[PDB]
Amino acid sequence: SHMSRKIRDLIESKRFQNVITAIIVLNGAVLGLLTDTTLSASSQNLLERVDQLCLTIFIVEISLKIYAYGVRGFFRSGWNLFDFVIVAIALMPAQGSLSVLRTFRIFRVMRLVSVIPTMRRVVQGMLLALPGVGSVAALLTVVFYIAAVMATNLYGATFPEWFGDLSKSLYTLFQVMTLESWSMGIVRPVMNVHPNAWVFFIPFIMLTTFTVLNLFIGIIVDAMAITKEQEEEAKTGHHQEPISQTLLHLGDRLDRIEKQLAQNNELLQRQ
Amino acid sequence: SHMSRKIRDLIESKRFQNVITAIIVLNGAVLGLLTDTTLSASSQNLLERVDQLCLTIFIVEISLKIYAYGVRGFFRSGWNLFDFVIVAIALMPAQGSLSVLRTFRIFRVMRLVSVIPTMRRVVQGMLLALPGVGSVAALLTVVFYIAAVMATNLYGATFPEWFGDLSKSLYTLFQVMTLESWSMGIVRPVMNVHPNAWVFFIPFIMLTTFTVLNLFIGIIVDAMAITKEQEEEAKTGHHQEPISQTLLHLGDRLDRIEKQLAQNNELLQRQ
Amino acid sequence: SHMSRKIRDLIESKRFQNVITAIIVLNGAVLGLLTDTTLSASSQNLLERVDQLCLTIFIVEISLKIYAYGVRGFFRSGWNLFDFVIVAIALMPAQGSLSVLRTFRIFRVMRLVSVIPTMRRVVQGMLLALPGVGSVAALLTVVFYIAAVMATNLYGATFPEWFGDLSKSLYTLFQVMTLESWSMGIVRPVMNVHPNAWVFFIPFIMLTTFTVLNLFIGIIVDAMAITKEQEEEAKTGHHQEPISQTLLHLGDRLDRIEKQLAQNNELLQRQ
Amino acid sequence: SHMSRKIRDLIESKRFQNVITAIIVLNGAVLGLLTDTTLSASSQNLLERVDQLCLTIFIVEISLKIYAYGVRGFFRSGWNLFDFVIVAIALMPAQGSLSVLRTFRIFRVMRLVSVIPTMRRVVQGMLLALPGVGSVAALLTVVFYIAAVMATNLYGATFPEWFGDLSKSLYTLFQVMTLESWSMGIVRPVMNVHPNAWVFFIPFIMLTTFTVLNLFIGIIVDAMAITKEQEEEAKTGHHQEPISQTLLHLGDRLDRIEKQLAQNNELLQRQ
């Protein structure tokens, strides 16, 4: 239709992208000003109305996108669904979830990631890298669970604040893995009651700092490669062979050309 | 035999793998519930029986594997031997080892690594990467030993809690390497008695944080390459030339093709 | 002109570079001696005159460069503009800027980077790598802003020293990201009032340490590649195809040569 | 000569290498036992004689090497000179150096690095990687010097324990860079007197943690490549083109073969 065509042209324009970006920045700025308790009643009401105006602009934005692209076409993108969920949750009356309150309107600033394409590409690369590290993340989970059960049984009765139950142990083991007061704060006091506690905590530190770094490097390397390959696919329109596949078959390809070259030499020498 | 053939088909099936996985998860869950001291006598007896049921299911599992594959064939795999050692140690009466107690039944959760193939491949890659870093791990050991002897002689008499003997010094040097209260907790108090102690501790920190990162990066890079190469070997059935070998001979291979190409050009120009 | 030609030859000489380097080192040494409060009035006046002599040598240096290369030619280089700004700011009477004082004459030691070419190349590579990580740096900024607004609203009234306003929260969140007393100093005291505060702080730590490492690795890898490629461009005089571009088209290039090779074989077999 | 030939064969043998290794291990073990103050007078005299026996075995070892290889040939290797310096310093009466005492006989354990070839190769790779990072190490030195001068002038009078002079400031800035109590221990107390001190310390942390990681990654990547290339050179006897040189010319080489291939196709189509 003619109506949907001119709306899509407006939506896809750089100025529309800039308008939405400016309103996200403004909404973030007013929410940051609203953290200040010393403000007057009128100053607070003024910022609250600017928050309402920002929200209504986003409702118009999303509605234009659903009309212009269609319900199936809009919800086809995970980025648009994210944008829809962020805006539509603000107008949701009494939600049945295990949450304290929906006071976190500042999560609307996270739309800068979805609206700005350079930021969208960076986050996309990271998200695409996550399934590939699932096994490493599960190994860390297994180590934490085993260690938390052991720490609860070994030290729960003598150090109940740090290890009195499974929740307490998982928390202090996270603290131990981050190396935060692990010795002066946790393990030297524990060793005053349990002298060989270093046998538990030093291998736990060695294994978890290793695994976390492995997980992080795994995500970083993959995200960087995925992003680089997606940019090339976007530039040329052709499918990009992943680098690992190029490196794995590099030897196979070179020797095959060496063979085809030597047989062409064989056909050449005798003519 | 017909009996061993249908048992191997059952063992190798995805449902059998899922049954074993569910029982490991269940056993881990009941052991985690057993860390809670507030439970009733009957609640504890109930979970203890679920632990017994889980163990008996693993005894059947392993026995089916020894019968179906043979004693030589089963113990041919390091993964099956690990599975055997984890389950068989629970039925071992009075073991002669330098251990406090075999209360750590939670180590059974480590079977999730051996049973889940994606997790098995990740750990396998890491294990295969370890011999290759042996020299770096030995260099760190040498630095720790030298430093612990020096720290004991220099500071043992004035700081006996931290350096009074070799064990105490190795422990606080591990703490110093992890950067945990190294200055406010250890070196500023030491410098009040020994003003030039920074000459010992700052180079020790520089060398050990460097070496640890070197060891960790070495393992991560190798494990990632080993895993990638093993997957390709499993997919195609052909031996995968290691990437380092492809990169080392890349120059040699390209110039050899350049030479074979130029001589084919030489045979072509004059005919 | 003959005057500008002999001045440029003098400027470009290794001895002129060594003279300037020696004066920067000397100026840095006298400023370091001037930090000592126990010095006599005459000792202080003596060093202050050596600081004046060093500054006057730099005024001559820069003036020779503007005359020899021309106003347009000198200010064409970002390195020369930096050198000009560092020296010319010392002779600036009453500047209108949001600064306490221009006592930081020690920033003149930063000229060692611009004057020594090996150091200039290293910093240049790093600077050229910065625009490419802009999106990651902006993602970290967004996470810090969102988290600081949340932390101010959640914990400002009960923990005003750490979260009483946006500035206070950004500061303690930076401290939390660096893992400095995050648990014993900040989150365990906060959890005594807000028991589920770990839900906020543990994901904040996981996301920001990850993003910072991503930003740092991104800069390091790019700077290393940019430097390596610029050296090759300087050595040969030919434009260096970036490594990513060589790796992305490696597969495309190899199969194209395989195809050209097979058709040459096809023309050869039938003659 | 016949005497030097049979001595070199003995020196180069695996058993001779194993004898020397065993004596280094033994010497290290006795020095570690000598750190214990509770030992008897006779127990101490016994270990001291085993230290003397170990030293005399090393004097024989080195003397056999100088005779068998020649003064010029032995001192041609940096590894042999290191071995000579470590052993010969023990027999040096009254040395004129800025040292407290030559009690550090435990540095003899560092010979495990020189005697064991796998360990020698690892350290060699690291040492060869150091000149290449000289510029990054100098940039960190410049940042530390500038920051130490600034910190001394800004905070020396109000925080003299941490910044009272240049030495004190360099020490606490090293502590700040390692993130050790940087905020709770140093910067929050400083900000109580100087509210904008975060403007100095947060950029200092960002720049130095970045530079240190850059220096460390630079050494790790280079050492790994140098080692891999030296092994290949040792295996084949042929000079190994560095990987960076192979990667820089990969594009140049591939297009040159594409060109030589297309002209061979041109000579083929028309015959």
Ligand SMILES: CC/C(=C(\c1ccc(O)cc1)c1ccc(OCCN(C)C)cc1)c1ccccc1
């Ligand atoms: C092609 C990108 C890619 C991987 C990749 C990216 C960059 C790179 O340098 C190398 C590979 C990839 C492939 C396999 C992989 O395996 C890890 C094990 N998983 C299955 C638990 C991880 C990433 C991938 C990611 C998710 C699903 C499928 C493929």
Ligand SMILES: CC/C(=C(\c1ccc(O)cc1)c1ccc(OCCN(C)C)cc1)c1ccccc1
């Ligand atoms: C040696 C090149 C390499 C990989 C590689 C090895 C052989 C091969 O034929 C192709 C590539 C590499 C790159 C990515 C990779 O991703 C898997 C990530 N996991 C942790 C999810 C694995 C190996 C690599 C490893 C670690 C960091 C950076 C690069």
Ligand SMILES: CC/C(=C(\c1ccc(O)cc1)c1ccc(OCCN(C)C)cc1)c1ccccc1
């Ligand atoms: C082929 C895999 C491999 C190595 C490798 C893997 C990935 C990669 O990118 C490069 C190499 C390997 C080879 C040599 C090596 O030497 C270190 C020194 N050791 C002997 C102390 C380490 C790993 C290896 C591992 C153990 C034994 C033999 C070979």
Ligand SMILES: CC/C(=C(\c1ccc(O)cc1)c1ccc(OCCN(C)C)cc1)c1ccccc1
């Ligand atoms: C530059 C590519 C490279 C290596 C390489 C260099 C030259 C060559 O011809 C082939 C590969 C590299 C990769 C692995 C490696 O493993 C040894 C691990 N040690 C620490 C056990 C060494 C170099 C590399 C080095 C560090 C991290 C990631 C990659």
Ligand SMILES: CC/C(=C(\c1ccc(O)cc1)c1ccc(OCCN(C)C)cc1)c1ccccc1
């Ligand atoms: C050619 C160097 C380069 C990049 C590069 C360097 C080394 C390397 O191994 C790979 C690439 C480069 C290219 C793209 C890039 O994208 C990140 C996203 N930005 C746009 C936010 C970053 C660096 C680059 C840097 C700035 C502008 C343009 C190009």
Ligand SMILES: CC/C(=C(\c1ccc(O)cc1)c1ccc(OCCN(C)C)cc1)c1ccccc1
């Ligand atoms: C796997 C090789 C690789 C990159 C690569 C992947 C595919 C390809 O065709 C070419 C190169 C790589 C290198 C640099 C890079 O820079 C982007 C930096 N961002 C974070 C600004 C991206 C990928 C890489 C990734 C992480 C660390 C080191 C190397």
Ligand SMILES: CC/C(=C(\c1ccc(O)cc1)c1ccc(OCCN(C)C)cc1)c1ccccc1
């Ligand atoms: C060939 C090894 C090498 C370098 C290298 C090693 C591995 C790798 O992946 C890439 C290069 C090398 C080359 C240049 C370099 O420049 C840094 C700047 N210096 C001059 C301050 C560093 C290392 C080198 C080291 C010292 C002197 C000369 C060359």
Ligand SMILES: CC/C(=C(\c1ccc(O)cc1)c1ccc(OCCN(C)C)cc1)c1ccccc1
């Ligand atoms: C992208 C491949 C690469 C380098 C590279 C880029 C282009 C090229 O043609 C060849 C190689 C790389 C490798 C080593 C290197 O060493 C310099 C070390 N400095 C810090 C002393 C520089 C770039 C690299 C960069 C960082 C980590 C691992 C690998």
Ligand SMILES: CCCCCCCCCC(=O)N(CCO)C[C@@H](O)[C@@H](O)[C@@H](O)[C@@H](O)CO
């Ligand atoms: C991948 C690792 C993931 C670690 C996840 C940790 C979650 C456990 C934290 C939690 O749910 N708590 C109950 C919340 O009610 C525990 C904390 O409250 C407790 O540990 C202490 O902070 C003190 O309150 C008691 O000393």
Ligand SMILES: CCCCCCCCCC(=O)N(CCO)C[C@@H](O)[C@@H](O)[C@@H](O)[C@@H](O)CO
């Ligand atoms: C690669 C690095 C590996 C470091 C290994 C450290 C092991 C040494 C620990 C040990 O065996 N102890 C004896 C156990 O009885 C020492 C601890 O007990 C002691 O250091 C303190 O914690 C206090 O108890 C005394 O102040």
Ligand SMILES: CCCCCCCCCC(=O)N(CCO)C[C@@H](O)[C@@H](O)[C@@H](O)[C@@H](O)CO
């Ligand atoms: C990318 C992350 C960037 C973080 C940037 C932090 C800047 C905020 C610091 C600031 O401007 N302050 C006001 C300066 O007047 C705050 C500090 O003063 C305050 O947080 C405390 O240090 C105490 O003074 C109060 O308890």
Ligand SMILES: CCCCCCCCCC(=O)N(CCO)C[C@@H](O)[C@@H](O)[C@@H](O)[C@@H](O)CO
């Ligand atoms: C690349 C970074 C290199 C940092 C190098 C630091 C060397 C400076 C240490 C030094 O020489 N001191 C004098 C030694 O006499 C200083 C210490 O003594 C002093 O800072 C404190 O520890 C206290 O003694 C006073 O509060």
Ligand code: NA
């Ligand atoms: Na740390």
Ligand code: NA
């Ligand atoms: Na810390």
Ligand code: NA
């Ligand atoms: Na820390």
